[PDB]
Scaffold this motif. Structure first.
Motif, PDB file in Angstrom:
ATOM      1  N   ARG A  37       0.811  -1.169  -0.091  1.00 54.34           N
ATOM      2  CA  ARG A  37      -0.049   0.089   0.197  1.00 54.34           C
ATOM      3  C   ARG A  37       0.890   1.232   0.023  1.00 54.34           C
ATOM      4  NH1 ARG A  37      -3.050   0.761   4.748  1.00 54.34           N
ATOM      5  NH2 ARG A  37      -0.825   0.447   5.355  1.00 54.34           N
ATOM      6  N   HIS A  38       2.334   0.834   0.156  1.00 51.19           N
ATOM      7  CA  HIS A  38       3.270   2.007   0.059  1.00 51.19           C
ATOM      8  C   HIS A  38       4.074   1.639  -1.487  1.00 51.19           C
ATOM      9  CE1 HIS A  38       1.970   2.766   4.009  1.00 51.19           C
ATOM     10  NE2 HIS A  38       2.765   1.676   4.590  1.00 51.19           N
ATOM     11  N   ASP A  39       3.426   0.876  -2.087  1.00 52.74           N
ATOM     12  CA  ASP A  39       4.103   0.647  -3.464  1.00 52.74           C
ATOM     13  C   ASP A  39       3.837   1.554  -4.395  1.00 52.74           C
ATOM     14  OD1 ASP A  39       5.473  -0.529  -5.173  1.00 52.74           O
ATOM     15  OD2 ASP A  39       4.796  -2.570  -4.909  1.00 52.74           O
ATOM     16  N   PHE A  40       4.377   2.595  -4.529  1.00 52.15           N
ATOM     17  CA  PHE A  40       4.236   3.691  -5.329  1.00 52.15           C
ATOM     18  C   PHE A  40       4.604   3.044  -6.621  1.00 52.15           C
ATOM     19  CE2 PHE A  40       6.758   6.366  -7.951  1.00 52.15           C
ATOM     20  CZ  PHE A  40       6.135   7.193  -8.384  1.00 52.15           C
ATOM     21  N   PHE A  41       5.876   2.238  -6.930  1.00 52.11           N
ATOM     22  CA  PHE A  41       6.104   1.884  -7.971  1.00 52.11           C
ATOM     23  C   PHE A  41       5.153   1.123  -9.018  1.00 52.11           C
ATOM     24  CE2 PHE A  41       9.586   2.359  -5.058  1.00 52.11           C
ATOM     25  CZ  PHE A  41      10.462   3.306  -5.673  1.00 52.11           C
ATOM     26  N   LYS A  42       4.492   0.480  -8.293  1.00 52.82           N
ATOM     27  CA  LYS A  42       3.544  -0.598  -8.807  1.00 52.82           C
ATOM     28  C   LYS A  42       2.371   0.200  -8.900  1.00 52.82           C
ATOM     29  CE  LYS A  42       5.286  -4.992  -7.213  1.00 52.82           C
ATOM     30  NZ  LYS A  42       6.108  -4.367  -6.218  1.00 52.82           N
ATOM     31  N   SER A  43       1.768   0.942  -8.242  1.00 49.95           N
ATOM     32  CA  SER A  43       0.563   1.837  -8.277  1.00 49.95           C
ATOM     33  C   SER A  43       0.533   2.450  -9.540  1.00 49.95           C
ATOM     34  CB  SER A  43       0.246   2.681  -6.969  1.00 49.95           C
ATOM     35  OG  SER A  43       1.161   3.621  -6.911  1.00 49.95           O
ATOM     36  N   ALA A  44       1.670   3.064  -9.888  1.00 52.85           N
ATOM     37  CA  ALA A  44       1.759   3.965 -11.160  1.00 52.85           C
ATOM     38  C   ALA A  44       1.532   3.288 -12.643  1.00 52.85           C
ATOM     39  CB  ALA A  44       2.934   4.653 -11.110  1.00 52.85           C
ATOM     40  N   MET A  45       1.732   1.841 -12.428  1.00 53.13           N
ATOM     41  CA  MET A  45       1.608   1.103 -13.621  1.00 53.13           C
ATOM     42  C   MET A  45      -0.017   0.841 -14.056  1.00 53.13           C
ATOM     43  SD  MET A  45       4.565   0.565 -14.329  1.00 53.13           S
ATOM     44  CE  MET A  45       5.883   1.185 -13.530  1.00 53.13           C
ATOM     45  N   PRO A  46      -0.063   0.780 -15.235  1.00 53.43           N
ATOM     46  CA  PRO A  46       0.640   0.763 -16.541  1.00 53.43           C
ATOM     47  C   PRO A  46       1.382   1.872 -17.016  1.00 53.43           C
ATOM     48  CG  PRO A  46      -1.546   0.498 -17.488  1.00 53.43           C
ATOM     49  CD  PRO A  46      -1.410   0.750 -15.881  1.00 53.43           C
ATOM     50  N   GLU A  47       0.484   3.213 -16.877  1.00 55.26           N
ATOM     51  CA  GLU A  47       1.116   4.147 -17.376  1.00 55.26           C
ATOM     52  C   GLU A  47       2.608   4.709 -17.023  1.00 55.26           C
ATOM     53  OE1 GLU A  47      -1.437   4.219 -15.026  1.00 55.26           O
ATOM     54  OE2 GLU A  47      -3.257   4.364 -15.681  1.00 55.26           O
ATOM     55  N   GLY A  48       2.976   4.388 -15.610  1.00 52.83           N
ATOM     56  CA  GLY A  48       4.342   4.217 -15.196  1.00 52.83           C
ATOM     57  C   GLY A  48       4.467   5.673 -14.540  1.00 52.83           C
ATOM     58  N   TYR A  49       6.019   5.687 -14.443  1.00 57.15           N
ATOM     59  CA  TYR A  49       6.478   7.027 -13.823  1.00 57.15           C
ATOM     60  C   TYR A  49       7.935   7.341 -14.621  1.00 57.15           C
ATOM     61  CZ  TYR A  49       9.268   3.199 -11.415  1.00 57.15           C
ATOM     62  OH  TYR A  49      10.037   1.995 -11.162  1.00 57.15           O
ATOM     63  N   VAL A  50       8.034   8.655 -14.493  1.00 54.49           N
ATOM     64  CA  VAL A  50       9.485   9.053 -14.726  1.00 54.49           C
ATOM     65  C   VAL A  50      10.579   8.925 -13.506  1.00 54.49           C
ATOM     66  CG1 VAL A  50      10.702  11.239 -15.275  1.00 54.49           C
ATOM     67  CG2 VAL A  50       8.606  10.694 -16.428  1.00 54.49           C
ATOM     68  N   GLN A  51      11.683   8.455 -13.969  1.00 50.23           N
ATOM     69  CA  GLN A  51      12.667   8.317 -12.887  1.00 50.23           C
ATOM     70  C   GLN A  51      13.897   9.079 -13.090  1.00 50.23           C
ATOM     71  OE1 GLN A  51      13.472   4.748 -10.476  1.00 50.23           O
ATOM     72  NE2 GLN A  51      15.554   4.650 -11.077  1.00 50.23           N
ATOM     73  N   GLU A  52      14.522  10.201 -12.259  1.00 52.75           N
ATOM     74  CA  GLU A  52      15.433  11.052 -12.535  1.00 52.75           C
ATOM     75  C   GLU A  52      16.433  10.796 -11.421  1.00 52.75           C
ATOM     76  OE1 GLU A  52      12.972  14.564 -13.078  1.00 52.75           O
ATOM     77  OE2 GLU A  52      13.126  14.442 -15.419  1.00 52.75           O
ATOM     78  N   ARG A  53      17.960  10.871 -11.863  1.00 53.77           N
ATOM     79  CA  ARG A  53      18.913  11.029 -11.070  1.00 53.77           C
ATOM     80  C   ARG A  53      19.790  11.915 -11.515  1.00 53.77           C
ATOM     81  NH1 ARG A  53      18.906   5.183 -10.566  1.00 53.77           N
ATOM     82  NH2 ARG A  53      17.728   4.432  -8.613  1.00 53.77           N
ATOM     83  N   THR A  54      20.787  12.423 -10.214  1.00 54.20           N
ATOM     84  CA  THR A  54      22.075  12.843 -10.435  1.00 54.20           C
ATOM     85  C   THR A  54      23.168  11.945  -9.964  1.00 54.20           C
ATOM     86  OG1 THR A  54      21.317  15.131 -11.213  1.00 54.20           O
ATOM     87  CG2 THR A  54      23.463  14.710 -10.657  1.00 54.20           C
ATOM     88  N   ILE A  55      24.165  11.397 -10.329  1.00 56.15           N
ATOM     89  CA  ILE A  55      25.184  10.679  -9.648  1.00 56.15           C
ATOM     90  C   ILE A  55      26.348  11.314  -9.653  1.00 56.15           C
ATOM     91  CG2 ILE A  55      26.352   8.398  -9.803  1.00 56.15           C
ATOM     92  CD1 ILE A  55      23.447   7.487 -11.127  1.00 56.15           C
ATOM     93  N   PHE A  56      27.043  11.932  -8.538  1.00 54.17           N
ATOM     94  CA  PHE A  56      28.150  12.580  -8.426  1.00 54.17           C
ATOM     95  C   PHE A  56      29.266  11.480  -8.197  1.00 54.17           C
ATOM     96  CE2 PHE A  56      25.116  15.967  -7.651  1.00 54.17           C
ATOM     97  CZ  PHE A  56      25.490  16.895  -8.256  1.00 54.17           C
ATOM     98  N   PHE A  57      30.207  11.271  -9.103  1.00 56.15           N
ATOM     99  CA  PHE A  57      31.263  10.479  -8.850  1.00 56.15           C
ATOM    100  C   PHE A  57      32.393  11.389  -8.316  1.00 56.15           C
ATOM    101  CE2 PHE A  57      29.205   8.224 -12.010  1.00 56.15           C
ATOM    102  CZ  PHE A  57      29.075   6.884 -11.711  1.00 56.15           C
TER     103      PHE A  57
END
Length: 224
Positions: A75-95
Protein backbone atom coordinates in the motif's frame (compact mmCIF):
# COMPACT_ATOMS: atom_id res chain seq x y z
CA UNK A 1 -4.56 -1.80 -9.46
CA UNK A 2 -1.11 -1.77 -11.02
CA UNK A 3 0.02 -4.32 -8.42
CA UNK A 4 -1.98 -6.97 -10.29
CA UNK A 5 0.28 -6.56 -13.34
CA UNK A 6 3.14 -8.04 -11.30
CA UNK A 7 1.49 -11.20 -9.93
CA UNK A 8 3.41 -13.36 -12.41
CA UNK A 9 6.77 -13.44 -14.16
CA UNK A 10 7.01 -10.20 -16.14
CA UNK A 11 9.41 -9.76 -19.11
CA UNK A 12 11.71 -6.77 -18.75
CA UNK A 13 13.15 -4.63 -21.54
CA UNK A 14 15.83 -2.02 -20.79
CA UNK A 15 17.18 0.52 -23.30
CA UNK A 16 19.80 3.18 -22.52
CA UNK A 17 21.17 5.95 -24.73
CA UNK A 18 24.29 7.49 -23.29
CA UNK A 19 26.78 10.29 -23.77
CA UNK A 20 29.74 10.72 -21.39
CA UNK A 21 32.32 13.44 -22.25
CA UNK A 22 31.29 12.93 -25.89
CA UNK A 23 31.72 9.14 -25.87
CA UNK A 24 28.30 8.01 -27.05
CA UNK A 25 26.99 4.50 -26.59
CA UNK A 26 23.89 2.38 -26.27
CA UNK A 27 22.86 -0.40 -23.87
CA UNK A 28 20.10 -3.00 -24.25
CA UNK A 29 18.79 -5.22 -21.48
CA UNK A 30 16.40 -8.15 -21.60
CA UNK A 31 15.25 -10.52 -18.90
CA UNK A 32 12.43 -11.00 -16.46
CA UNK A 33 11.26 -10.03 -13.01
CA UNK A 34 9.28 -11.68 -10.22
CA UNK A 35 7.93 -9.13 -7.75
CA UNK A 36 6.39 -11.89 -5.63
CA UNK A 37 9.85 -13.02 -4.55
CA UNK A 38 11.66 -9.83 -5.60
CA UNK A 39 13.90 -11.43 -8.23
CA UNK A 40 15.37 -9.89 -11.39
CA UNK A 41 17.47 -11.66 -14.01
CA UNK A 42 18.66 -9.50 -16.89
CA UNK A 43 21.35 -9.57 -19.55
CA UNK A 44 22.74 -6.26 -20.82
CA UNK A 45 24.67 -5.64 -24.03
CA UNK A 46 26.47 -2.48 -25.13
CA UNK A 47 25.14 -2.59 -28.69
CA UNK A 48 27.59 0.00 -30.08
CA UNK A 49 31.05 -1.32 -29.23
CA UNK A 50 33.11 -1.15 -26.06
CA UNK A 51 31.30 0.42 -23.15
CA UNK A 52 33.21 3.67 -22.45
CA UNK A 53 32.32 3.62 -18.74
CA UNK A 54 32.58 0.67 -16.33
CA UNK A 55 29.60 -1.66 -16.18
CA UNK A 56 28.97 -1.38 -12.40
CA UNK A 57 28.54 2.42 -12.62
CA UNK A 58 25.38 1.83 -14.69
CA UNK A 59 23.80 -0.75 -12.42
CA UNK A 60 21.51 1.65 -10.53
CA UNK A 61 20.48 3.38 -13.74
CA UNK A 62 19.61 0.11 -15.52
CA UNK A 63 13.09 -1.01 -12.06
CA UNK A 64 12.14 -0.65 -8.39
CA UNK A 65 8.59 -1.72 -9.24
CA UNK A 66 9.96 -5.27 -8.98
CA UNK A 67 10.81 -4.96 -5.29
CA UNK A 68 8.95 -7.48 -3.18
CA UNK A 69 6.58 -5.45 -1.05
CA UNK A 70 5.22 -7.70 1.72
CA UNK A 71 1.50 -7.95 2.48
CA UNK A 72 1.66 -5.32 5.20
CA UNK A 73 3.07 -2.64 2.89
CA UNK A 74 1.38 -3.47 -0.35
CA UNK A 75 0.00 0.00 0.00
CA UNK A 76 3.20 1.95 0.03
CA UNK A 77 4.07 0.57 -3.35
CA UNK A 78 4.16 3.70 -5.40
CA UNK A 79 6.14 2.06 -8.18
CA UNK A 80 3.48 -0.57 -8.90
CA UNK A 81 0.52 1.75 -8.32
CA UNK A 82 1.80 3.97 -11.17
CA UNK A 83 1.56 1.09 -13.67
CA UNK A 84 0.79 0.60 -16.58
CA UNK A 85 1.15 4.30 -17.39
CA UNK A 86 4.27 4.29 -15.25
CA UNK A 87 6.61 6.89 -13.84
CA UNK A 88 9.53 9.13 -14.69
CA UNK A 89 12.72 8.32 -12.79
CA UNK A 90 15.40 11.01 -12.60
CA UNK A 91 18.80 10.98 -10.94
CA UNK A 92 22.04 12.85 -10.64
CA UNK A 93 25.04 10.72 -9.68
CA UNK A 94 28.17 12.48 -8.47
CA UNK A 95 31.38 10.50 -8.86
CA UNK A 96 33.63 11.90 -6.16
CA UNK A 97 36.54 13.86 -7.65
CA UNK A 98 35.15 13.08 -11.09
CA UNK A 99 32.23 13.90 -13.33
CA UNK A 100 28.54 13.22 -12.97
CA UNK A 101 25.75 11.31 -14.69
CA UNK A 102 22.32 12.86 -15.14
CA UNK A 103 19.62 10.35 -16.04
CA UNK A 104 16.00 10.59 -17.06
CA UNK A 105 14.06 7.37 -17.53
CA UNK A 106 10.48 6.32 -18.19
CA UNK A 107 9.33 3.06 -16.58
CA UNK A 108 6.12 1.67 -18.03
CA UNK A 109 4.39 -1.30 -19.60
CA UNK A 110 4.39 -1.69 -23.37
CA UNK A 111 1.99 -4.54 -23.97
CA UNK A 112 2.95 -7.23 -21.44
CA UNK A 113 6.56 -6.06 -21.00
CA UNK A 114 7.96 -3.76 -18.34
CA UNK A 115 10.14 -1.25 -20.22
CA UNK A 116 12.81 0.96 -18.65
CA UNK A 117 13.87 3.55 -21.26
CA UNK A 118 16.78 5.80 -20.27
CA UNK A 119 18.69 8.81 -21.50
CA UNK A 120 22.02 9.38 -19.74
CA UNK A 121 24.29 12.44 -20.01
CA UNK A 122 27.71 12.56 -18.34
CA UNK A 123 29.97 15.63 -18.05
CA UNK A 124 33.18 16.81 -16.36
CA UNK A 125 34.82 13.36 -16.35
CA UNK A 126 38.57 12.95 -16.06
CA UNK A 127 39.84 10.95 -19.03
CA UNK A 128 42.31 8.96 -16.91
CA UNK A 129 39.94 8.75 -13.94
CA UNK A 130 38.35 5.60 -12.61
CA UNK A 131 35.34 5.86 -14.91
CA UNK A 132 36.60 6.87 -18.35
CA UNK A 133 39.83 4.99 -17.61
CA UNK A 134 38.07 1.72 -16.65
CA UNK A 135 39.66 1.37 -13.22
CA UNK A 136 36.74 -0.14 -11.26
CA UNK A 137 36.44 -3.81 -10.29
CA UNK A 138 33.72 -5.90 -11.94
CA UNK A 139 31.59 -6.40 -8.81
CA UNK A 140 29.02 -4.57 -6.70
CA UNK A 141 28.55 -3.11 -3.22
CA UNK A 142 24.81 -2.80 -2.83
CA UNK A 143 23.35 -0.06 -0.66
CA UNK A 144 19.97 0.39 0.96
CA UNK A 145 17.68 3.09 -0.41
CA UNK A 146 15.62 5.09 2.07
CA UNK A 147 12.46 6.00 0.17
CA UNK A 148 10.61 9.13 1.32
CA UNK A 149 7.32 10.36 -0.06
CA UNK A 150 7.21 13.68 -1.95
CA UNK A 151 3.60 14.91 -1.83
CA UNK A 152 4.67 18.05 -3.69
CA UNK A 153 5.17 16.36 -7.06
CA UNK A 154 3.08 13.34 -6.05
CA UNK A 155 5.95 10.83 -6.22
CA UNK A 156 8.93 9.82 -4.11
CA UNK A 157 12.56 10.74 -3.65
CA UNK A 158 15.74 9.26 -2.25
CA UNK A 159 19.41 9.91 -1.92
CA UNK A 160 22.01 7.25 -1.22
CA UNK A 161 25.68 6.40 -1.74
CA UNK A 162 27.08 3.61 -3.93
CA UNK A 163 30.68 2.45 -3.40
CA UNK A 164 32.71 1.06 -6.32
CA UNK A 165 35.91 -0.80 -5.50
CA UNK A 166 38.84 0.72 -7.38
CA UNK A 167 41.06 -1.92 -8.98
CA UNK A 168 44.21 -0.62 -7.30
CA UNK A 169 43.01 0.29 -3.81
CA UNK A 170 40.52 3.08 -3.46
CA UNK A 171 36.81 3.20 -3.14
CA UNK A 172 35.09 5.29 -5.79
CA UNK A 173 32.02 7.02 -4.37
CA UNK A 174 28.83 7.49 -6.43
CA UNK A 175 26.47 9.91 -4.71
CA UNK A 176 22.90 9.25 -5.90
CA UNK A 177 20.02 11.77 -5.80
CA UNK A 178 16.72 10.45 -7.10
CA UNK A 179 13.17 11.70 -7.68
CA UNK A 180 10.26 9.81 -9.22
CA UNK A 181 6.93 11.21 -10.41
CA UNK A 182 3.99 9.41 -12.06
CA UNK A 183 3.46 9.74 -15.78
CA UNK A 184 -0.31 9.26 -15.54
CA UNK A 185 -2.94 11.24 -13.69
CA UNK A 186 -4.80 8.57 -11.73
CA UNK A 187 -4.52 8.03 -7.99
CA UNK A 188 -1.13 6.79 -6.78
CA UNK A 189 -0.02 5.49 -3.41
CA UNK A 190 2.25 7.78 -1.45
CA UNK A 191 4.38 5.61 0.85
CA UNK A 192 5.29 6.13 4.40
CA UNK A 193 9.07 6.29 4.43
CA UNK A 194 10.61 2.84 4.11
CA UNK A 195 13.67 0.98 2.84
CA UNK A 196 14.57 -0.97 -0.29
CA UNK A 197 17.22 -3.65 0.26
CA UNK A 198 18.99 -5.01 -2.79
CA UNK A 199 21.45 -7.86 -3.40
CA UNK A 200 23.27 -7.71 -6.75
CA UNK A 201 25.46 -10.31 -8.47
CA UNK A 202 27.39 -9.45 -11.63
CA UNK A 203 28.70 -12.09 -13.99
CA UNK A 204 29.61 -12.84 -17.59
CA UNK A 205 28.14 -15.02 -20.32
CA UNK A 206 31.01 -17.29 -21.52
CA UNK A 207 29.44 -17.70 -24.97
CA UNK A 208 28.87 -13.94 -25.37
CA UNK A 209 31.52 -12.06 -27.32
CA UNK A 210 30.03 -8.56 -27.09
CA UNK A 211 30.70 -6.26 -24.14
CA UNK A 212 28.04 -7.27 -21.66
CA UNK A 213 26.84 -7.72 -18.09
CA UNK A 214 24.62 -10.45 -16.69
CA UNK A 215 22.83 -9.25 -13.57
CA UNK A 216 20.95 -11.19 -10.91
CA UNK A 217 19.13 -9.19 -8.29
CA UNK A 218 16.99 -9.80 -5.20
CA UNK A 219 15.16 -6.89 -3.61
CA UNK A 220 12.67 -6.40 -0.81
CA UNK A 221 10.98 -3.44 0.84
CA UNK A 222 10.97 -3.05 4.62
CA UNK A 223 9.11 -1.00 7.21
CA UNK A 224 10.36 1.32 9.99
Amino acid sequence: KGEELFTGVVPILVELDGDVNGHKFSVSGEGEGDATYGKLTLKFICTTGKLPVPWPTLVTTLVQCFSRYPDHMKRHDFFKSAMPEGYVQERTIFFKDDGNYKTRAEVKFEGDTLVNRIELKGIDFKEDGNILGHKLEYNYNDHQVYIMADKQKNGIKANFKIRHNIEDGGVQLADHYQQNTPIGDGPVLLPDNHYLFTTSTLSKDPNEKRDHMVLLEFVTAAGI
